[PDB]
Unconditional design. Structure first.
Lengths: 99, 110, 83, 100, 208, 151, 127
RNA sequence: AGAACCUUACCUGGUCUUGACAUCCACGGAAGUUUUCAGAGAUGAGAAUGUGCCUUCGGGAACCGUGAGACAGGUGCUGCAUGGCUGUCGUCAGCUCGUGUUGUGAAAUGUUGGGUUAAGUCCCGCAACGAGCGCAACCCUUAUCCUUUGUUGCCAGCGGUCCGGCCGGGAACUCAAAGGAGACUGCCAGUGAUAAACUGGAGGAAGGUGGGGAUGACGUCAAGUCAUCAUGCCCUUACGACCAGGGCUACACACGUGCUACAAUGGCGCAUACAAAGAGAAGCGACCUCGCGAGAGCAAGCGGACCUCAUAAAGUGCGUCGUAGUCCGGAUUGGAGUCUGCAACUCGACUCCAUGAAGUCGGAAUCGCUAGUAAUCGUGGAUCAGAAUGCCACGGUGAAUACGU
């Protein structure tokens, strides 16, 4: 089975990507597993915002890396190849893995 | 076909290195194209080819949800083996007839 | 202290100098900056003027000084008293 | 930071890049309990001979824009001050002010 | 240092990011550095061309730049001569295949950054700062800004004691997150010193 | 506070006897949010006390409490140049609390070994009308009496 | 046939199932006395049942995750209450009166920059 | 958001001077690759390979070498020349403007007054009428529900069992995200000026801003920062650059902020239960073997809801100690060692064995906190080779009190 790991910072974008991938899968092949949402990584950062000194002065940023696990149960001839030409939107790191 | 983007081009009335049809001929032969998308409503294809011989429509590096149903539609006739052509087509979806003059200011997305 | 498996530490150059001295049988003081160098059995008898940051202070090596380092016998700070 | 400091850092990095294979090998030799004493000694001495700037524990992480040694972040390669600026500008992707 | 950055507070809601890519902790710093480089280069090059926003977007080991500029003609030059030139240098800077797009900025009086730049330029060529500020404000208003504020600070008219002066017109709500507040800044490197120019331009509120 | 009076928060009755007062006492006793240990101690105190005086566990405790509750406490107005301590009638909710607190203090003070044992002893004393808490109560009363002129 | 209610309190998440029976409580394949060593916890889990005389009438299978002991107990209680509500739907008023239907929304307040804790400010001095 | 070296800006010596870092020509050499002796090292002297993209051949672009200067360089001075960024009063409810009107005018009015509010919040009046910046709302998070999607997450009901959700499976539940619903004084009664509101109650997961965060008006302090950065006199064979060693860790003393204690609500021993949130490829490193232990060896699983860090601790049960400077307390010092690292002397952390200071709740005075708060218990992260009792995060247990001004 083809496991697909979508990773992105924007959630909407990721969602869009996932849908597209599903569409790509579903026309060619059959029995797409589904878009399973894994836990989001909220990598936080604190920094001092003064140039020199004021330690209680701080900004707390974060990067929300979202995960989408799409799986394809039956890899056909037509389906797997379809993704080669079918590149997804920018800012979405995909990671296909058969078996 | 709505917008055609050829590399190393200034306007549509120029000419290019290594081809037969001129650029107005290429735009007419691209206006005759027959595409069938499934999921999206606006896609971008890619055509890249070098070498002596005609450029069919079957040489476009397709994505998954686009289907080019005329694999003998000719576009160019590449004559020089050192010549290349890399155009990026944009395929919308609508109805009726919307021409270039009205679509000269209608287009909002700068 | 240093690990037993690693052995004792002595600066290579310093060691060489010591060897040379031994060969000679001379007793002129060897000015040295290697304060981190451990003292060796063969170094016994030699005067070796160890740097203290500022100046080289003469250290006549003894049987008791072997396990120790050269910087132990060359104090850097110079405090007499507050009054 | 100064230009000079930056240059020094660069040099150090270069040295590290150069001498990695040898240094690592030497380290391995030194570690290896199933080995000769003399060999080990040689290795130890050999290491000393190699340049100091060849060590990776010599090089300090500085900001890639300003060269500021302190307040550094690894993910961005930038000092806090610059990082913040980047965030404000939209230049770091995904990064926005966090509240919870 | 009272105020929060108006762009920065709104990135999740009404404002988008400039650099728009994903990368793991491994390649992220490098990417950032590259972005910084390319942007810097672009600024250096297209100073005379009125450039507002460089948007970098890298998918699949290939960098896509998008230059928002008021006059494409000077950035493009002859059709695909200057752009092409820019591209290879961009690629070099990055170390990947480059692709430059050029967005045409409609209404450069309403783009805040551009306005700021203009003001700075004016300052440099020894105009009355106040008159420049007025012009900036007025023009924006005319163009259909719901509001605009501009602020200039330090060594105004080469005076020994530095001060800040600012002109607002219309409404410029900063606490309101859903307000499209185009904020940007610039610096006039005059004979007496630097003169920092801030400008806030309120396009309107977004409803979603 | 200035602006608004607020409703006292909900307190659960203890699992052994099903009493609010007991629970409150336990809470008072507690330190570092170690409730369980404190409650155990309280239980121990009760049991020993029960053994000593007969009656029930709860009833005895109540009786003990009764002998250390203050009718009247004092507060410092100080309107003049020197300070005047003024008596005030101390309300039902507060009086109960105060007695408990005093008892706890006494227990803490006491020279016996285990905490629970000490507590038990204190309770016994209260019941009999000798000890530390009782003394404190008397003192409080005495002060009030002294300053009865102010009202 | 088995009825159900979800329990939640602090970071705990109980899964209470109500069935008709004799009144044996199992929490993660362990008895009430085994799982909760604390009496208070036991009391809290039995509270709702005590309030509406169905202690002997119904068995309940529970599995709980997250939080500590007291929190877990609370969650369990909540779950039980929910189950009861589902099952009868005429005991709601009593439950409301008790204060068991209410999800106790008290979470731990986050630590805040500047402060050592949620509210503890560091030691101040003019000099 | 981490001084052994480095960092480093300081000291001591040893050295360099178009230079460590750039651009420019001139012309000597392809770059680079390997190795040798002296030296603390910086540097100062040797042996091997190569000639790629192009020439009506006066040669070129990358990358070393030498000399000239143009210049580089400066964590040098001025934060009282500046920008930017920051603190602060203060998340205090304020601060203004246009037009009108009043006053010779500075100014006033609006913005005051009656009520009310967390709020210049809202209503009513009124020479004001309007507007803006702020007080509110929009944003994140947390509390309830529903829909969607179910692996690496889950196990209600089914069968099988090595009694492990592990394996058939199931999509219920938890959980995971994505999208919706929900709270508005909307509904009820009373008080109120026919009001804005207030007081209570109904429902509800939540009630009157539900809890928390982000958000900081005009301005103030010639507040802080020229040593992040940028920027408007001074040094330029040295106030620049390279190096090794030392110092920033000094110690009659005074203050600030913390940790650990002084014990029995405890210490010690044995058993045993319940978290959250994070990090991880020059990385996290199971299992197994060895070591009293720090660790060592071997070495899977894993860019990770999968594997690893990783046993939560307080707690609970049973035993012991019995108020002692103690089976409290752990400083200090001796020995021996482990790991990181060219390198632990100055000056790392941790381990083992020994040693066992002061300290029995702290003078004048003084700080924090109104709830999942304080108090207490552990856990993680950043910087980081190594080096936290600090900082930033996470959950566990979990109070007291608020009469009032």
């Amino acid at each position: 089975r083809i496991r697909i790991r979508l990773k992105a910072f924007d959630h909407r974008l990721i969602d869009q990507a996932t849908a597209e991938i599903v569409e790509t899968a579903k026309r060619t092949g059959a029995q797409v597993r589904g878009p399973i949402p894994l836990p989001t990584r909220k990598e936080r950062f604190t920094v001092l915002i003064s140039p020199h000194v004021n330690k209680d002065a701080r900004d707390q940023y974060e990067i929300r890396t979202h995960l989408r696990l799409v799986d394809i149960v039956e890899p056909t001839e037509k389906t797997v190849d379809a993704l080669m030409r079918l590149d997804l939107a920018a800012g979405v790191d995909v990671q296909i893995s058969l078996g | 076909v709505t917008e055609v983007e050829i590399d190393g081009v200034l306007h549509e009335y120029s000419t290019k290195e290594g081809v037969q049809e001129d650029i107005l001929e290429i735009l007419l032969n691209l206006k005759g194209l027959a595409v069938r998308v499934q999921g999206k409503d606006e896609v971008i294809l890619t055509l890249n080819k070098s070498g002596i011989g005609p450029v069919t429509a079957a040489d476009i590096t397709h994505d998954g949800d686009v289907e080019i149903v005329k694999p003998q539609h000719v576009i160019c006739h590449l004559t020089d083996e050192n010549a290349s052509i890399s155009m990026r087509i944009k395929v919308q979806r609508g109805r009726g007839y919307v021409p270039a003059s009205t679509r000269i200011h209608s287009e909002e997305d700068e | 202290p240093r690990s037993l498996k690693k052995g004792p530490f002595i600066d290579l150059h310093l060691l060489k100098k010591v060897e040379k001295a031994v060969e000679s049988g001379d007793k002129k003081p060897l000015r040295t900056w290697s304060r981190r160098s451990t003292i060796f059995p063969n170094m016994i008898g030699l005067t070796i003027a160890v740097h203290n940051g500022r100046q080289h202070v003469p250290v006549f090596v003894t049987d008791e000084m072997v396990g120790h380092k050269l910087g132990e016998f060359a104090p850097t700070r110079t405090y007499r008293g507050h009054a | 930071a100064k230009q000079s400091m930056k240059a020094r850092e660069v040099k150090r990095v270069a040295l590290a890049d150069k001498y990695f294979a040898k240094r690592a090998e030497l380290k391995a030799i030194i570690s290896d309990v199933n080995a000769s004493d003399e060999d080990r000694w040689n290795a130890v001495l050999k290491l000393q001979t190699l340049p100091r700037d060849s060590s990776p524990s010599r090089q300090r992480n500085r900001c890639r824009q300003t060269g500021r040694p302190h307040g550094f972040l690894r993910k961005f390669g930038l000092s806090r001050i610059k990082v913040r600026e980047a965030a404000m500008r939209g230049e770091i992707p995904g990064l926005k002010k966090a509240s919870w | 240092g009272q105020k929060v950055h108006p762009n920065g507070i709104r990135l999740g809601i009404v404002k988008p990011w400039n650099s728009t890519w994903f990368a793991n902790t491994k390649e992220f710093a490098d990417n950032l550095d590259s972005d910084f480089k390319v942007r810097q280069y672009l600024t250096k090059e297209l100073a005379k061309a009125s450039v507002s926003r460089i948007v970098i977007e890298r998918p699949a080991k290939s960098i896509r730049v998008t230059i928002h500029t008021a006059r494409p003609g000077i950035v493009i030059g002859k059709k695909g001569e200057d752009v092409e030139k820019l591209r290879k240098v961009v690629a070099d800077i990055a170390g990947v295949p480059a692709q430059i797009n050029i967005a045409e900025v409609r209404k450069p009086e309403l783009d805040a950054k551009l306005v700021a730049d203009s003001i700075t330029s004016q300052l440099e060529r020894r105009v009355m700062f106040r008159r420049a500020m007025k012009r900036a404000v007025q023009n924006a208003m005319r163009l259909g800004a719901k509001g605009i504020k501009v602020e200039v600070s330090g060594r105004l008219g080469g005076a020994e004691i530095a001060r800040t002066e600012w002109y607002r017109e219309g409404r410029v709500p900063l606490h309101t997150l859903r307000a499209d507040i185009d904020y940007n800044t610039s610096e006039a490197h005059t004979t007496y010193g630097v003169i920092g120019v801030k400008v806030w331009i309120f396009k309107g509120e977004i409803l979603g | 506070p200035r602006r608004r009076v607020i409703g006292q928060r909900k307190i659960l009755p203890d699992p052994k006897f099903g009493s609010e007062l007991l629970a409150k006492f336990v809470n008072i006793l507690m330190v570092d949010g170690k409730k369980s240990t404190a409650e155990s101690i309280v239980y121990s105190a009760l049991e020993t006390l029960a053994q000593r005086s007969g009656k029930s566990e709860l009833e005895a405790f109540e009786v003990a409490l009764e002998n250390v509750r203050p009718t009247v406490e004092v507060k410092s107005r100080r309107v003049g140049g020197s300070t005047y301590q003024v008596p005030v009638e101390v309300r039902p909710v507060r009086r109960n609390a105060l007695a408990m607190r005093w008892i706890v203090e006494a227990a803490r003070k006491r020279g016996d070994k285990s905490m629970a044992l000490r507590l038990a002893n204190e309770l016994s004393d209260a019941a009999e009308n000798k000890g530390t808490a009782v003394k404190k109560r008397e003192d409080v009363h005495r002060m009030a009496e002294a300053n009865k002129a102010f009202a | 046939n088995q009825y159900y209610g979800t329990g939640r309190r602090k970071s705990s998440a109980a899964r209470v199932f109500i069935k008709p029976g004799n009144g044996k409580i199992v929490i993660n394949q362990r008895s009430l006395e085994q799982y909760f060593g604390r009496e208070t916890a036991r009391m809290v889990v039995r509270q709702p049942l005590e309030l509406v005389d169905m202690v002997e009438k119904l068995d309940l299978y529970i599995t709980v995750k997250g939080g500590g002991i007291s929190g877990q107990a609370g969650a369990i209680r909540h779950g039980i209450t929910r189950a009861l509500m589902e099952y009868d739907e005429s005991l709601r008023s009593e439950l409301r009166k008790a204060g068991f239907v209410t999800r106790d929304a008290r979470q731990v307040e986050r630590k805040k920059v500047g402060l050592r804790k949620a509210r503890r400010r560091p030691q101040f001095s003019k000099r």
